[PDB]
Design a protein around this nucleic acid. Structure first.
Ligand SMILES: [K+]
Ligand SMILES: [K+]
Ligand SMILES: [K+]
Ligand SMILES: [K+]
Ligand SMILES: [K+]
Ligand SMILES: [K+]
Ligand SMILES: [K+]
Ligand SMILES: [K+]
Ligand SMILES: [K+]
Ligand SMILES: [Mg+2]
Ligand SMILES: [Mg+2]
Ligand SMILES: [Mg+2]
Ligand SMILES: [Mg+2]
Ligand SMILES: [Mg+2]
Ligand SMILES: [Mg+2]
Ligand SMILES: [Mg+2]
Ligand SMILES: [Mg+2]
Lengths: 96, 274, 85, 63, 131
RNA sequence: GGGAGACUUGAGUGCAGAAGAGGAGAGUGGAAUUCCAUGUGUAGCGGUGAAAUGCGUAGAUAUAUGGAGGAACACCAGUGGCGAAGGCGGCUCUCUGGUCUGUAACUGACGCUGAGGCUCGAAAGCGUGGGGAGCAAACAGGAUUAGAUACCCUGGUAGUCCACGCCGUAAACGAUGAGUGCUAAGUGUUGGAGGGUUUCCGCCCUUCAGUGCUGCAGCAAACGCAUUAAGCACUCCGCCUGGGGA
């Protein structure tokens, strides 16, 4: 399998329970599409080096995952994350 | 795809048509067929009101569900079928409760897709949602201008529109024509673009084929008599010989805009094109 | 896949532990050639990868030529097993 | 001195913004490996990590 | 790929001789040994020895330089090549430098010099000239 | 040369590692330009050797806020890397080729070259359909000039980008075919490998394969080439036989 790391920025305004619901929704997306969510953490809450979508602040949440390369879980996360408004920016990188 | 005919005859020469590969059956739904008569461009007065129409092949109307307001259950795409009345193809879909219907076939539609309608529907090709629930940047079709009236815009083969943004109770849309305008957010649309994108590339090939498609010959005004057309008359071939080319009823034909100047939709039209 | 390569090595091995041999090499080359043909059919414009495929094809033909030169019976058996011309 | 080598870290996360900040000049521009005394291999890895950090907003593009 | 180890042997000798190296080494082959021993008994090369390894063996040649480091071997030349073979009849055996040099020939009587070949009145394949 | 054996060096596979703008597909980030909208704000801005065209009192340039969208990927960056060549530089992921270094388990000459064929092949160009900010043949205007169908200036269409399909040419160059072996050193640098140290980092020694520079013998008409030969040799291929006409 291949190991991915997904760090995405939730807009800072979000409520705690809304944030928790969003986190679990995206974790469910990964699992159902065929990935193995081996870790999901709320990494930090940081100011942005530059304004992103008009925001200078955000909540960085990390998700370490490991999925078959052919599985479309990563691709589906990209699609749904891009569509969703809460998440500002998502980075998916292979981790060796 | 488009198949080109070998030049076995002058008529057949340069002719092209669609292979109809996507079409999966040639047996329309008896339940949804309705009769249609060829008006041949004649109104209740019986006068020819629109020229160059009539003749051609007999057609049965297929009842398309432009409303897509059955949000209760998903509809499974049973077949892709050819529709004589529209450039796009249609899709027969079964609702899990047993209601059969036809929809426009979006680009990429496949038999077995389980489409859904309503606010909770996912953003998938063929699903129908109110415009408010469609994320910006989405490509859509079968847009309705008045809620509940059914899709009216973006229904020809290969056409598409894009959702640009929201404001107030309206949603900004770029139409296939390139015009940018506001549309009531409560209106619905279908995710995707109209399939059969290749339709425009067909080369009709011969006059008889136009006749099949119900187009009667078009006669240039320049070869009519003066009492028939403003361009008529004159010895030999003649130029326009007027201030500008005009229709048979004197309406200028090149660049003269005909949209009503006090149209109520000017408030909603943001940027015009065409 | 390394796992796939090992399994095919075992199937066509002339004897125990035989990795390099006309039979094993040709079979592995054939599998990669078929697999890479699908990739090329998907990516018509991947000319660099396609040259790799052509080098593989040439190498496999050379091995087959050598094998037919040496042992015709093994050559006939191998083409039968692998469905080659 | 190759600071990366001295620290003996063969994995250069694009999240260790503190680690990255010691390889960029003011204005956010990246420093030459000849300036920093580091190796070529680690220089390439630093470039990738810094660029990833910039795209995710951890580091500034300019200023 | 190497196509004429005999020519390679001759060229190894020529290059080593040109730089006045004391010794040289070559992969061992029967015909190479025949040429080496011919040169040895003709006094061109100082000494010859053979080593056995697990590839094909090795042959080491110690070059001969006269007084004042003068080169004994003026040059070597490959006559018969894989591209074109050179066969000479008994009366066609050549003389290198009017006999001062030698011509190594392969015959049904073995690998012999030009003098020996014409003494036996047999032809063969002219492997090389040396002088 | 032919037949029957044997061998492992060449060749390839296995196994353990290394780097990389190699290719393809779909996404995505920031600076800038231009344009759009609206503030502020008034007399120019722009440009040249000097000018003028041009834009600006219908309020320009500038200026702040955003918005739009096209293209290229600053810094890193390096006779650095990769590719057979053309060529490949933002980042991510999917697919994918090749190369190098070890080990020596495997096959046991299976190799080299390669007419004819086939594939790839910068830029421009062509076809269909897209897209189109900047730049820019053509072209327009202002200058220069004896003239200026130019150099210069202000604009600017095709094109430059994308998908598909053609086209098959370049100073497509190292103006140096490929394979192999041999023949002083010195010094850089790329990716590995081993040892001797070193607490580690690191430094010393050996070596594999690139990449530079310097430089022996040798070669050369000279210029220069010199283990990345144009030196010493063998194999195969392509090609040359005074200039013009061409
Ligand atoms: K998003
Ligand atoms: K025709
Ligand atoms: K139709
Ligand atoms: K007509
Ligand atoms: K007339
Ligand atoms: K690879
Ligand atoms: K074009
Ligand atoms: K070196
Ligand atoms: K002549
Ligand atoms: Mg008409
Ligand atoms: Mg008439
Ligand atoms: Mg009239
Ligand atoms: Mg008239
Ligand atoms: Mg007339
Ligand atoms: Mg081009
Ligand atoms: Mg030429
Ligand atoms: Mg070197």
């Amino acid at each position: 399998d291949t190991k991915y790391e997904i760090m995405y920025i939730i807009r800072p305004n979000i409520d705690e329970e809304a944030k928790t619901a969003l986190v679990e929704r995206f974790d469910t997306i990964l699992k159902d599409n065929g990935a193995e969510v081996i870790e999901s953490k709320d990494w930090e809450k940081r100011r942005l080096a530059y304004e992103m979508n008009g925001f200078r602040e955000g909540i960085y949440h990390i998700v370490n995952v490991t999925s078959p390369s052919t599985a479309g879980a990563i691709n589906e996360f990209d699609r749904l994350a891009k569509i969703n408004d809460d998440i500002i920016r998502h980075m998916i990188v292979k981790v060796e | 795809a488009i198949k080109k005919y070998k030049p076995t005859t002058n008529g057949r020469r340069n002719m092209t048509s669609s292979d109809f590969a996507e079409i999966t059956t040639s047996t329309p739904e008896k339940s949804l067929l309705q009769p249609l008569k060829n008006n041949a461009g004649r109104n209740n007065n019986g006068r020819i009101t629109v020229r160059h129409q009539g003749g051609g092949h007999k057609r049965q109307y297929r009842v398309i569900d432009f409303k897509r307001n059955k949000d209760n259950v998903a509809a499974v795409v049973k077949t892709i079928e050819y529709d004589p009345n529209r450039s796009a193809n249609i899709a027969l879909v079964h609702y899990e409760d047993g209601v059969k219907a036809y929809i426009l076939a979006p680009k990429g539609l496949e038999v077995g897709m389980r489409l859904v309608s309503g606010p909770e529907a996912d953003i998938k090709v063929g699903n129908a949602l109110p415009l408010e629930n469609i994320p910006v940047g989405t490509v859509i079709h079968n847009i309705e201008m008045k809620p509940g009236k059914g899709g009216q815009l973006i229904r020809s083969a290969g056409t598409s529109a894009q959702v640009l943004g929201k404001e107030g109770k309206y949603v900004l849309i770029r139409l296939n024509s390139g015009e940018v305008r506001m549309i009531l957010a409560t209106c619905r649309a279908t995710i995707g673009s109209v399939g059969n994108e290749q339709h425009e590339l067909i080369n009709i090939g011969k006059a008889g084929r136009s006749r099949w498609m119900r187009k009667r010959p078009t006669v240039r005004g320049s070869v009519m008599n003066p009492n028939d057309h403003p361009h008529g008359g004159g010895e030999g071939k003649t130029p326009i010989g007027r201030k500008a080319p005009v229709s048979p009823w004197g309406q200028p034909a090149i660049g003269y805009k005909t949209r009503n100047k006090k149209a109520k939709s000017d408030k909603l039209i943001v940027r015009r094109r065409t | 896949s390394q796992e796939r390569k090992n399994e095919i090595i075992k199937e066509y091995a002339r004897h125990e532990g035989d990795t390099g041999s006309p039979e094993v090499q040709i079979a592995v080359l054939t599998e990669d050639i078929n697999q890479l043909n699908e990739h090329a059919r998907t990516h018509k414009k991947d000319h660099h990868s396609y040259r790799g495929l052509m080098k593989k094809i040439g190498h496999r033909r050379n091995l087959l030529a050598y094998l037919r030169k040496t042992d015709i019976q093994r050559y006939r058996e191998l083409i039968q097993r692998l469905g080659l011309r | 001195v190759d600071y990366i080598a001295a620290n003996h870290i063969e994995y250069i996360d694009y999240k260790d913004t503190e680690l990255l900040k010691r390889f960029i000049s003011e204005r956010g521009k990246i420093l030459p490996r000849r300036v920093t005394g580091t190796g070529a291999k680690n220089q390439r890895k630093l470039t990738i990590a810094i660029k990833r950090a910039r795209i995710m907003g951890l580091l500034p593009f300019v200023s | 790929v190497m196509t004429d180890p005999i020519a390679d042997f001759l060229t190894r000798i020529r290059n080593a001789n040109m730089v006045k190296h004391e010794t040289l080494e070559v992969p061992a082959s029967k015909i190479k040994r025949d040429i080496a021993e011919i040169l040895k008994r003709e006094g061109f090369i100082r000494d010859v020895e053979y080593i056995e390894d697990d590839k094909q063996g090795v042959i080491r040649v110690f070059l001969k330089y006269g007084k004042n480091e003068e080169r004994v071997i003026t040059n070597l030349k490959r006559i018969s090549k894989p591209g074109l073979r050179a066969y000479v009849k008994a009366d066609e055996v050549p003389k290198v430098l009017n006999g001062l040099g030698i011509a190594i020939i392969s015959t049904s009587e073995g690998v012999i010099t030009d003098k020996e070949a014409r003494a036996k009145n047999i032809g063969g394949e002219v492997i090389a000239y040396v002088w």
